[PDB]
Amino acid sequence: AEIYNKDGNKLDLYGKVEGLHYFSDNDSKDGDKTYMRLGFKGETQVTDQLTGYGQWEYQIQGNEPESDNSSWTRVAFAGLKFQDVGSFDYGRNYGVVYDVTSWTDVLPEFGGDTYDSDNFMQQRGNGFATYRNTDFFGLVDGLDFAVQYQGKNGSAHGEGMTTNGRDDVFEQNGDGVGGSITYNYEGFGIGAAVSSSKRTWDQNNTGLIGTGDRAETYTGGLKYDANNIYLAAQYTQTYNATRVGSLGWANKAQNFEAVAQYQFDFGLRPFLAYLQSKGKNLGRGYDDEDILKYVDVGATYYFNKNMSTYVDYKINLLDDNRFTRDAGINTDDIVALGLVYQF
Amino acid sequence: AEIYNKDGNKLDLYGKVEGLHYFSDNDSKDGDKTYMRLGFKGETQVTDQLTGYGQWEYQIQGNEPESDNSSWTRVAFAGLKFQDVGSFDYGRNYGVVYDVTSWTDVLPEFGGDTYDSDNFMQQRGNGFATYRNTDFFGLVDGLDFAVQYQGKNGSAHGEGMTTNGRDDVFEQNGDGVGGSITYNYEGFGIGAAVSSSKRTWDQNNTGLIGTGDRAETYTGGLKYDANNIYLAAQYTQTYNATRVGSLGWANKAQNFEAVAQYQFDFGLRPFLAYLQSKGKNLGRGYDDEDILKYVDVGATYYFNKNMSTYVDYKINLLDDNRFTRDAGINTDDIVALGLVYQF
Amino acid sequence: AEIYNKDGNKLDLYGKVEGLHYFSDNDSKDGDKTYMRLGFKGETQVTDQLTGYGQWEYQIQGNEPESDNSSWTRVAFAGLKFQDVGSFDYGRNYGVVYDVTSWTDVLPEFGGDTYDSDNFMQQRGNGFATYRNTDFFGLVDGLDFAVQYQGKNGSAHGEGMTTNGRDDVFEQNGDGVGGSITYNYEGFGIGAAVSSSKRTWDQNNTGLIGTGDRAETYTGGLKYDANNIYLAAQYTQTYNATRVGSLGWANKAQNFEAVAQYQFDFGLRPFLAYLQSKGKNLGRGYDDEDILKYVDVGATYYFNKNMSTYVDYKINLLDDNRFTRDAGINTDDIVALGLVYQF
Ligand SMILES: CCCCCCCCO[C@@H]1O[C@H](CO)[C@@H](O)[C@H](O)[C@H]1O
Ligand SMILES: CCCCCCCCO[C@@H]1O[C@H](CO)[C@@H](O)[C@H](O)[C@H]1O
Ligand SMILES: CCCCCCCCO[C@@H]1O[C@H](CO)[C@@H](O)[C@H](O)[C@H]1O
């Protein structure tokens, strides 16, 4: 909620409490999943053209006991925006791949999981320098593009080290570049995004699958957002980029997400979806294996802009086999029941 | 403080800094105890009858160095409330036992410690689904009741596991049900609350005292709140529910708290109290032993709605013996000196 | 930003996102250094004379992955202030030494590092009871003084223990007293501050350098703040107080900081600085060694009260030798590039 607006600066303090509960035969995905998010979006007017901004967003689990409570920063960046020239921001933010893949990431709780956080330039991560452009310098109504750089986030100790080092190799990344082009026009949307990033020595020399000099992704996306209907689909091909449970990464992966939603006037919003992640030439005798594969069904009911409830049902199509057990990937169904307050 | 109220939704952002210091011969209870709380209470009007809400509250210790700072979510829930039918909320909240036992939990710093947090349904804990009713469907002015369910919060690894697992057995709980009835009338208050919950395999199979299939509690409470006077008392009998230091739980426990307070017009509010927790048939050669026993004396001075100071003096009546030393229970006195700002 | 002000109480909710990046040949000081601060300053009017207040400030790193995010309380105190008599506050706060040494701590990112946090009474730390006086009881315009007490912050286990114990000996302290006198007059500033504090048994009996019964400091400071110019300098002599990397403390240390800044009307603010910390009679064959020594150059550009960017360049004059390598002190240069949003 916009709690402050005076003399050029305005601040939006926003958050939600998500009363959430998972039902699953997988005990590790069964139980209380309640959490809270808090954040601010700031905006200051510098000149006629220039404006400065800063966003921060934070998650604090609400399903843990008081002796040990986990929380983390989702985004934290600051930037400048100049009318018809572009914007620049730096900090923890979403990678440019997400500019397109986010069109399918629209379900209440599940979905958007053919990629993780801190997964190179595919979603949220540290050290993003991002240039964005709206309506191609104000000339083409609806044509947006972005060029982004991510600086190396290395290990905590030894060489290949950075000030913000991290022992988990799945959260590390070398220097990377990516970009995206988006075009919307009266309901329709065509999108593309490419990214390439050096992989660190640690994530290429600890006996994991899917090693190589670079982690790369290629994304294309379609959508339709009008007349109470939402349809979307994204296709992304990755190399040494998609995480394969605990085993490592997939040398090659073909990701597909599709979503269909409808919005009734009285507040109900059913949805149907299908996600899939096919790994190819994984090595170590695995060959071609589904990393992710599930239908997702359910509905959200909006009481209000501030209150909603939902049922989100993940029908897991993965088979329980030696590959999935070695990686520790969930093959069981999950039902998420939500009750959410926002402001 | 209510920092936002517009078009049906209103938000109260509240908090306090409690400048606090303990004086004690027990070194582990002697020193700086300064802390901070922050929270929001949200309320959105859906219809004439229906309203949606969400509360979050957080504690962050202010007595630690910057290298290592502990903090935790006290509550985090979201709910709906329908006039003259009831309310429903889910998330981290207070158990229904507290509906009555909270009448004695009214001292500045000590008190309210014949039970812990994450102690089955006795106080704050994860995964509470709570139904509450005000004035018995609007028919009986002052008759409130509540029915509550808590879902299993298991271990972090192995079986008996949940998505929000926790290695500390004292914070675990199986599926539980409880309830409470409250009646207030022109200053007086009669209350009752029962709760029963399955205990987990981990908390019944790690060689601790007070094991059994179920942890159970039975509570009755009296009070008087008028003419600048506050009196209250609660009696709760527990089985396999009251924690006994580190040794385990008490197979049977009889808890009693009594409080007397008076409020002077100029801001001073003296108080006298007595808490006691008698364990019975504890096993392992212990027999009947006081788990908790102390008089509590002192006073708060209110400068304002936003500023207060207090002296809270815990006279520990427990004897230092092999039982208390084995459990690690404090037998020494503590004096808490407070200086508090609120908003 | 002042987000609340009603019926005597007013609350300022303030924060910043600092998009920050270090460039260094030292890998441990090279990379993303992005962070966020959040805080509130509260003020309640009790009477004509008396006012109650409370400040809290918090840092949350923005350069870490979601699996592991570090954050900490910088300050957390509550106090009363009586017109022309003085103020009193308790909690986590700045020590009185900082009343003078803070005049040089005015650079964007570096500087203010001839002392650490939780470093006895030299900067921020737990358990400060501080009395302050403005304009010497309202008699002398510009003469301020302060008397401060810090209570022992001991170890986590054993004896020499406190309720807020801490295993890191560099964060521990015994009972201490200090004070400061400040005089400002039409742009000029003369300041002095002394502090003495018992050192704990743990920090005198773990085989570190710079042991002794007491950690002591003696500070003098000059400054000039007017006509778009800022000049400042502080000299502090310490005994058993200045931390020497990992090796321990310096038995004797002579600290000097000097700063020169200029503020252009169009927003640019160049600065030049020099910090130095000379250790004397360090023991263990080290003799006299520079603990800290660097020139600091750069500039901040203010777009606005809410938005700024800066280059902060630390020219490290320390030589790489066996002393600095044993202590783990950085001898390499660092360049910090900042983009900041505030509110
Ligand atoms: C507002 C500040 C903008 C800073 C943009 C970041 C510039 C990228 O800086 C990069 O950081 C990497 C470590 O993360 C180093 O390995 C690279 O050498 C360096 O070029
Ligand atoms: C808004 C969402 C409401 C969800 C109410 C919680 C329903 C209780 O769900 C319970 O959770 C337990 C694990 O915690 C499981 O062991 C039980 O089988 C399950 O019934
Ligand atoms: C608002 C509350 C004000 C309390 C002021 C703190 C009083 C100092 O209390 C000191 O604490 C030390 C441990 O930290 C003990 O070792 C000392 O014996 C004790 O005097």
Author numbering:
A (entry chain A), B (entry chain A), C (entry chain A): 1 to 343
The article reads:
Porins, which are beta-barrel proteins that traverse the bacterial outer membrane, facilitate the uptake of small polar nutrients and are the main entry pathway for many antibiotics. L3 folds into the channel and narrows the pore at about the half way point, forming a “constriction zone” or “eyelet” that governs the effective pore size. At the eyelet, there is a strong transverse electric field due to the presence of conserved basic amino acid residues on the barrel wall facing acidic residues on L3.
The mutations observed in going from OmpC20 to OmpC33 cluster around the constriction zone. In OmpC26 and OmpC20, a water molecule and S271 are at the centre of a hydrogen bond network. In OmpC28, the S217F mutation changes this network and moves the tip of L3 (centred on E109) slightly further (<1 Å) into the pore (but not at the constriction zone). The S271F mutation does not appear to influence hydrogen bonds. Direct measurement of cell survival shows that a porin-deficient strain of E. coli transformed with OmpC26, OmpC28 or OmpC33 is, in each case, less sensitive to cefotaxime than the same strain transformed with OmpC20. We do not believe that trimer destabilization is the principal cause of altered permeation for the following reasons; OmpC26 and OmpC28 are stable but are, like OmpC33, less permeable to cefotaxime, OmpC33 is functional and conducts small ions as a fully open trimer, OmpC33 can be purified and crystallized as a trimer and finally OmpC33 transformants are actually more sensitive to a different antibiotic.
